[PDB]
């Protein structure tokens, strides 16, 4: 599993739910190759690949968990790949519904016994701690998390 | 019920701007899109732009473009549209229209504003 | 951008005849599942109401009467029995890509 299975494989429950464009991967692995995303999270290892999003018909975060850690390049210069664990897809229309986003995983991020957690839990029990936490949140209004963008890999 | 009031008539001067107001009620404000579509005097409708109140994140149809700013007031839940340079072609209805679709990327649209009449002239 | 040619531009129906308005897309406004398609009523000197959204769906409110149909390009709205209070004029709408276009619009005047 390259970076390319697991782009598809996360972009693939948008595109059924109507959210994204049908090529919204290609453009998201395009845009990976230009400017690429992997975070060393200060525990686990991070990526986030997003996009432009005039091709987004709405907000959505798709969360993918390996188990078996894949290398992405990461934008902090570097030519060291990151291990990265855990995969968060973000998809927004504008430059404003990004950097909301992104302070807001920022924060997600930074929580290790909240990130300690996601490793070692279900599908089930992932969803319903992140919509709790994006609840909780008085911006993140017109992101969608539903209970099938969550997936192992 | 929804309902989308929309600013008073106004008669804009050539080269000078507008901006006008659509108050929403009956919903979560921040929860669904907010658009603005233009009828002109032919009664042809082109549709402007969208933004999302959340966010102040604003897409724009690119005729109208660096032409058209879509704000939002997330207190009084009311919907501002501004457009500069404005010239006889502009003379037109300007509707604010809501959404309807919560997060589906449907993006039709359920409920149009009140309407406010643009004139242009000297 | 997207043409959407509405055709009839004027549609002259009696009483309790069937009224079929036409909108065609210069493009396939169809992807996945998803027909990405409304009509809308605009009723002399009123906003536009919601009548199809998704080519298909009723809102709610809208009297069964109203029908969509059409995938592709082609979408067709019908009218089975048509009421007095049913004259107004009906445009078309995709939100495939942006920019959202409409139709010139269809004007339904009832024979008499």
């Known amino acids: 599993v390259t970076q390319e299975d697991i782009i598809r494989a996360l972009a693939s429950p948008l595109i059924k739910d109507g959210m994204v464009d049908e090529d919204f991967a290609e453009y998201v692995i395009a845009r990976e190759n230009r400017s690429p995303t992997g975070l060393q999270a200060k525990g686990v290892g991070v990526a986030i690949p997003h996009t432009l999003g005039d091709y987004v018909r709405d907000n959505a975060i798709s969360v993918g968990i390996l188990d078996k850690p894949v290398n992405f390049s990461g934008w902090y210069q570097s030519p060291d790949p990151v291990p990265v664990r855990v995969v968060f897809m973000l998809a927004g229309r504008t430059w404003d519904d990004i950097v909301i986003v992104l302070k807001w995983i920022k924060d997600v991020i930074l929580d290790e016994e909240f990130m300690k957690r996601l490793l070692n839990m279900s599908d089930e029990e992932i969803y319903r701690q992140i919509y709790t936490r994006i609840s909780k949140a008085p911006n993140l209004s017109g992101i969608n998390f539903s209970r099938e963008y969550v997936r192992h890999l | 019920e929804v309902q989308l009031q929309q600013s008073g008539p106004e008669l804009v001067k050539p080269g000078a701007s507008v901006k006008i107001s659509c108050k929403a009620s009956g919903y979560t404000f921040t929860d669904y899109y907010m658009n603005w579509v233009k009828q002109s005097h032919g009664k042809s409708l082109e549709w402007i732009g969208d933004?999302?109140?959340?966010?102040?994140?604003?897409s724009y149809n690119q005729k109208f473009k660096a032409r058209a700013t879509l704000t939002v007031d997330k207190s009084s839940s009311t919907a501002y549209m501004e457009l500069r340079s404005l010239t006889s072609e502009d003379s037109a209805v300007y509707y604010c229209?809501?959404?309807?679709?919560?997060?589906?990327?449907?993006?039709?649209?359920?409920?149009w504003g009140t309407g406010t009449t643009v004139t242009v002239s000297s | 951008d997207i043409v959407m040619t509405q055709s009839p531009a004027s549609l002259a129906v009696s009483l309790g005849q069937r009224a079929t308005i036409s909108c065609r897309a210069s493009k396939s406004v169809s992807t996945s599942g998803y027909n990405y398609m409304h009509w809308y009523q605009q009723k002399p000197g009123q906003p536009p109401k919601l009548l199809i959204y998704?080519?298909?769906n009723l809102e709610s409110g809208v009297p069964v009467r109203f029908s969509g149909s059409g995938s592709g390009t082609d979408f067709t709205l019908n009218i089975h029995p048509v009421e007095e209070e049913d004259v107004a004029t009906y445009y078309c709408?995709?939100?495939?890509?942006?920019?959202?276009?409409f139709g010139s619009g269809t004007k339904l005047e009832i024979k008499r």
């Open positions: 709408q995709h939100s495939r890509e942006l920019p959202f276009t």
């Open positions: 229209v809501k959404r309807g679709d919560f997060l589906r990327g449907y993006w039709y649209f359920d409920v």
């Open positions: 933004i999302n109140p959340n966010s102040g994140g604003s």
């Open positions: 998704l080519a298909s």
